[PDB]
């Protein structure tokens, strides 16, 4: 696999080049329309994450099904980082906590706390794209229902690519001048935030969705 | 605080010494189970485990330095993840089965007894299988369990004040200490720097799946109107105070 042969710098370059554009905008009507448009770009992005297209179509879809809302959320948090107290859904749709008032406010608050954490950590764009790719590969990897040799090979492949992204994160940190200790600490801090992003996605899903079949068709096209 | 002064070896020792006991399910013969009776047994067991979890939490270095309020917030967010990771750990050497207790070892098909239970069973079994495939060690397990306790609720402190920022900072420092501890255990076991960082990542990424399982488990516990079976703020506070 070409993905497992990438250096840290090539992995970053490939991920930065794959980044979808920032899109423009009844509040739920506007968010829904925006999310719908974002989804098409997310599929194209996923196909460019090194390692992803090596998987069967079925496994690609499973991964997108599990990760789609976390991916939208982490993008939102990233866009909102420089706007304390506000969520930048789009450049023309910047909302503060009070506008979250319609259990919308609960999720708003969680998103704001994530943005605040990213800001306090001085999260870099290179780190962001790594984390977003981790979400895509990791979120669905533990819920593959299959026990065929193929499924075992797919899971192993995902874990190898995830290891590559870990190596990439550590490289970016060493280059930035962090000590070995600081490198491991920051890697941990970044990965632990992913647990909170999962939580937010689960709560978001309760409040609320692309089907397996819809995602498969979008991937095939 | 003397938690931030511990070496990696003292952190491990303190965590190993804090481990709660393995409890038995009600000696309660009646088999096979109904949906109601299985949930009755799991609920009773979980209730009894909760008291020991609070005693355990109080012995996680750094935890008692936090206000009582923050301690409860953390336990509120983490309790089901902690029960689950314990279950997964106990089940590691029993492929295809969940060891709820030494006298309550269930296979996938017994999950079907409770509607919606089988999906979560399958998730738990997959986690046990991943731990087995990674050859997860006891010292690593206790570190991961303490991370869950300190991490799960840390991002949902409403934090207006300098005090809240000091509490969060303290938690993040203790979490950094547990990370250092995990890496130390790995270096001692002979892993290269690269292998150390990779394994740390692999372990922390499983925590996202444990969160997911907790969230799904919480839904199911509501969905079968067990609403007042999640421990209340007040219950957790009283258990902490005692
Ligand atoms: C209530 N909520 C509001 C709040 F959370 F923001 F407060 S929410 O439910 O969680 C909602 C909020 C946020 O998560 C949900 C989601 C959404 C996804 C798909 C959709 O259409 C269906 C597609 C097919 C409609 C809404 C939002 C979003 C949109 C764009 C983006 O870049 C990042 C996040
Ligand atoms: N199907 S389930 O809901 O997910 C079921 C499984 C899992 O969540 C439920 C149950 C439970 C937790 C608390 C409670 O009230 C107190 C009542 C039932 C879990 C458990 C119990 C003990 C343990 O050691 C590990 C996991």
Curated annotation (Swiss-Prot), chain A:
Widely expressed. Not expressed in the pituitary gland. Residues 7-221 are annotated as: Transactivation AF-2. Phosphorylated by cyclin A/CDK2 and CK1. Phosphorylation probably enhances transcriptional activity. Self-association induces phosphorylation. Phosphorylated by LMTK3 in vitro. Residues 1-221 are annotated as: Interaction with AKAP13. Changing residue 212 to A: Reduces PELP1-mediated activation of transcriptional activity. A lipid is attached at residue 130 (S-palmitoyl cysteine). Changing residue 214 to A: Abolishes interaction with NCOA1, NCOA2 and NCOA3. It is found in: Nucleus; Golgi apparatus; Cell membrane. 17beta-estradiol binds at residues 38, 79, 207. Residues 1-221 are annotated as: Self-association. Residues 7-221 form the NR LBD domain. The modification Phosphotyrosine is found at residue 212. Selective estrogen receptor modulators (SERMs), such as tamoxifen, raloxifene, toremifene, lasofoxifene, clomifene, femarelle and ormeloxifene, have tissue selective agonistic and antagonistic effects on the estrogen receptor (ER). They interfere with the ER association with coactivators or corepressors, mainly involving the AF-2 domain. It is linked to Estrogen resistance: A disorder characterized by partial or complete resistance to estrogens, in the presence of elevated estrogen serum levels. Clinical features include absence of the pubertal growth spurt, delayed bone maturation, unfused epiphyses, reduced bone mineral density, osteoporosis, continued growth into adulthood and very tall adult stature. Glucose intolerance, hyperinsulinemia and lipid abnormalities may also be present. Composed of three domains: a modulating N-terminal domain, a DNA-binding domain and a C-terminal ligand-binding domain. The modulating domain, also known as A/B or AF-1 domain has a ligand-independent transactivation function. The C-terminus contains a ligand-dependent transactivation domain, also known as E/F or AF-2 domain which overlaps with the ligand binding domain. AF-1 and AF-2 activate transcription independently and synergistically and act in a promoter- and cell-specific manner. AF-1 seems to provide the major transactivation function in differentiated cells. Nuclear hormone receptor. The steroid hormones and their receptors are involved in the regulation of eukaryotic gene expression and affect cellular proliferation and differentiation in target tissues. Ligand-dependent nuclear transactivation involves either direct homodimer binding to a palindromic estrogen response element (ERE) sequence or association with other DNA-binding transcription factors, such as AP-1/c-Jun, c-Fos, ATF-2, Sp1 and Sp3, to mediate ERE-independent signaling. Belongs to the nuclear hormone receptor family. NR3 subfamily. This is Estrogen receptor. The chain holds residues 305 to 546 of 595 of the full protein.
């Amino acid at each position: 696999s070409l993905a497992l042969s990438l250096t840290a710098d090539q992995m970053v370059s490939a991920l930065l080049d794959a980044e979808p554009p920032i899109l423009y905008s009844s509040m739920m009507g506007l968010l829904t329309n925006l999310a719908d448009r974002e989804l098409v770009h997310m599929i194209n992005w996923a196909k460019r994450v090194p390692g992803f297209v090596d998987l069967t179509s079925h496994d690609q879809v499973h991964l997108l099904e599990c990760a789609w809302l976390e991916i939208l959320m982490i993008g939102l948090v990233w866009r909102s980082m420089e706007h304390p107290g506000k969520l930048l859904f789009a450049p023309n749709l910047l909302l503060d906590r009070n506008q979250g008032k319609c259990g919308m406010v609960e999720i708003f608050d969680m998103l704001l706390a994530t943005s605040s954490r990213f800001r306090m950590m001085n999260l870099q764009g290179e780190e962001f794209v790594c984390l977003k790719s981790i979400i895509l590969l990791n979120s669905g990897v533990y819920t593959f229902l299959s026990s065929t040799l193929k499924s075992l090979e797919e899971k192993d492949h995902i874990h190898r690519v995830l290891d590559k992204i870990t190596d990439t994160l550590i490289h970016l940190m060493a280059k930035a001048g962090l000590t070995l200790q600081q490198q491991h600490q920051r890697l941990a801090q970044l990965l632990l935030i992913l647990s909170h992003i999962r939580h937010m996605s689960n709560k978001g899903m309760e409040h609320l969705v692309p089907s397996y079949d819809l995602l498969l068709e979008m991937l095939d096209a």
